[model samples]
Target chain A: QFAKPEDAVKYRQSALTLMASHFGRMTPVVKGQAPYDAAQIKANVEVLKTLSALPWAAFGPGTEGGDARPEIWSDAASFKQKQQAFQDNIVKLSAAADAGDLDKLRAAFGDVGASCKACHDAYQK
Target chain B: QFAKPEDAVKYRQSALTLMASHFGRMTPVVKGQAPYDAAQIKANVEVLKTLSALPWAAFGPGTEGGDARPEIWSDAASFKQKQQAFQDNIVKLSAAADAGDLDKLRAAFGDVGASCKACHDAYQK
Candidate 1:
């Protein structure tokens, strides 16, 4: 939550590291070796933990040395609206990830991307 | 843009005021009084100007005293990916706004929102 670039970097590394270790192994299995369902279910709990952290992991507000753009302040209302929407969907994704429901994750991931686009398009440079 | 929440606030206020005065008046007409066509056309040109300024307006990088979160330095790749996507979509929005093409604007708006969700979901807290 701090507004600093260093924390963003730190968090991203954490996310990437986890994803690489866990989801990375599952990608092939989910995509080819086996059905996405099993893989999705297999990683559900951990995925939920990560999914829950996704928003903050990527954009915690209170940190310092951030690369956050000014839009967080300038477009506060829209930004907050998007934030809520993102969290809501992340919760949904967490459910899917928890259940290892491939279809759900696939659908939810798309929704998540949509939420990302709104603010990114309006605020990010 | 600079990563300060304070600057983000400053920029968002400007956008809100401008939108409140201009598009705010037009929204009613487009929704109730008349087709969005004429309004779209009239507003498009100004919108293009505003849309052009949007990314920079909300999230300027160099300004001080902003409320930017620390994600910029944290997740460099994904952040930049979202950033590019945002700018590209905004350019399309600018074209729609420039031409007063409501349909185009509406369509592009969806795309823009998708871009917004990417970063907001992952980073914004």
Candidate 2:
């Protein structure tokens, strides 16, 4: 649906926000800060898994108008590497959620959050 | 992760907004208002399919905040029915997207939007 780079940029931004919100929803449960509802954690993880596939495609050429740093293109290799690491964490998080292992889920969640911060620190303004 | 009813309410609202934003992203392509990219449509639909499972579960008890009307529980039967209809449309929309039939996709999209409107008109403030 995105014809212009700007459109892709806006779409990806929205997608990432959505993805982050779902990830946030799982945090309290995974950390044992809230009542552990296994079903809730599974549901949140499943949604996060689907959202994990969305935002990267929107990083294609011409999507430079937002907070995205120029380095996303100038250093495409590193950017792609960071993005891949983020996706890998999401996969691990989903697997941990499905396995009903809270300790593993917490560790996976930490990895995912760190991956997010790593990319944002270098790639977003 | 939600311990309070208000927490559930907020989570569901966020989830629905995320779902709708992704759905909106595909509208231009689905309606032929923008260039037809098969890959984009497929990606958008797959995301929507994952989100389709999210909001309903959040409608459990004590989630009557924001714009959600009490009818969502008062008329629980009808609400569930409408929700199911929406889910069915999402499933069909995903299938149409996977099959790469723009015409069918467009029709399914219409049905999904209608389902959304029908529920919102009756249940949203």
Candidate 3:
């Protein structure tokens, strides 16, 4: 959807970078380094969920680069499946945060983390 | 909230870039260059609202640099007023989008656009 390959790269990188910041921001609470504010975490999960769907569109055909491996476009089906998996995991994470269940949030968070890492490991340079 | 000054700069810049993309994405619709999709615009405004609150925290003391002008920190109160102004405009934009009122959406969008430009012109190099 971007006008240039550079725009696509910048868009995806910015989205992914913001995702990393929001995700990392929760680490303190997740690891017991800070108190868990249910409302705050709930709001953050919404942000994360919104961001989860962003990077993929920027990964559309001919719009690749910026940490993306060629397989992301070449092996399209697997990439899409991973995208759906990431979204699914984020949905669970949202559910846990909405319920203010720290244990469930932790579990969901771990699942999403793995999904992120796996996708990155397989698809990013 | 970042571990280092550089992290703060990265986070703020990333968030700002994303805010620009999502906001600019609607330009075509706003300008009648593209058809407006209510559901799509509604979802996008939500993403914009979430990003609206992100960058300010990263602009806290000792986190200066990037395109930020010294006045942003030196004239702190004015900076905060501008921040609130942008958020308020975005809230109105969100309301218009949710109601599927294109005219109202367009008006609110312009207000937000002005706020963004004014903030940048005065605060960024």
Candidate 4:
């Protein structure tokens, strides 16, 4: 069977959702609602580090379905730049979490979230 | 509330399924059912590179409710070695794909899949 483009789109979405879920592990602590658990933060950050590369590569020409807007293709350069920013922040988040510094981690976590939101605002429905 | 270990388990499974899905993109080409598309293979391999670090880290203690066998924890050293093997193959696969050499890509893809299967056979239920 020919490789269905929708499969790639679904794969991309699955990767994104799981990435967000891993980041969610640190959200409560970042918000001060939950106590800082350095180990959990580190584990989630490690997963996030792995996931940071996934969502963008799946955005090939035919993968225009789902919440992804057409702008992702029409404005490919910008989309990729935003993705780079997201990846960069994820690296920073991992470093912060690894350092086990609550303040730095909180800041890095917020930056990562902002990058995700910025990308979604421009590219996702 | 404590972050539920089951949530971590589910997160890990989601990441794995999606990783496999991206890897699936190249299977038909590797198996000769579909013609080789260098771009798609490269893209999929890039995503796989991102995912290579996820499964092992998610195998932290308390993440025992999934299809993951207890051996993942009981034989942690061996499990990690298998995962390291998987990660290594993935890096090789990515380099092969980037080189755009069909023969090398096919061989590296096989190595990556073997590592995955070996880990699953030993650790997943």
Q: Interface RMSD (Å), each candidate?
A: 17.9, 3.3, 1.4, 4.0
Q: What root-mean-square deviation over C-alphas does model 2 reach?
A: 3.9
| lDDT of residue A9 for candidate 1 | 47
| Candidate 1 residue-wise lDDT, B10-111, digit = tens | 544443333223333344443445556655555443543342333334544543343345665466677677767876886786677667666776676667
- Please give the lDDT score at residue A90 for candidate 1: 65
lDDT of 4 by residue, B37-69 (tens): 888788767767777666666677777878888
Estimate, for each residue in A6-111, the C-alpha lDDT of model 1 and write its tens digit: 6454554443333323333444443556555555454443443443344343544543333446666555577677768866776776677767667776776667
In order, the Cα lDDT scores of the candidates are 0.53, 0.82, 0.90, 0.80
Question: Which regions in candidate 4 have their CA more than 4 angstroms from the true location?
Answer: A1-13, A26-125
DockQ of 3: 0.75
Would candidate 2 be rated incorrect, acceptable, medium or high by CAPRI criteria?
acceptable
Root-mean-square deviation of Cα positions for candidate 1 versus the true structure, in angstroms? 19.7
Q: After superposition, how far is residue B121 of candidate 3 from its true place, in Å?
A: 1.6
Best by TM-score: 3
> Per-residue error at A111 for model 3, in Å?
1.3
Measured against the native two-chain assembly using Cα atoms, what DockQ does each of the candidate structures obtain, in the order listed?
A: 0.01, 0.36, 0.75, 0.33
Which portions of model 1 miss their true places by more than 4 Å?
A: A1-34, A37-45, A48-51, A54-67, B1-125
For model 4, what is the alpha-carbon lDDT of residue A115?
Answer: 91
Q: Which structure is stronger by DockQ: 1 or 3?
A: 3
Worst 10 residues of 1 chain A by lDDT: A15-24
The superposed Cα distance between candidate 1 and the true structure at residue B41, in angstroms, equals 56
* lDDT of each residue in A1-107, candidate 4, tens digit only: 11678877767777787877778766778989988888978877876787777677678877779888888898888888999999999889889989999999988
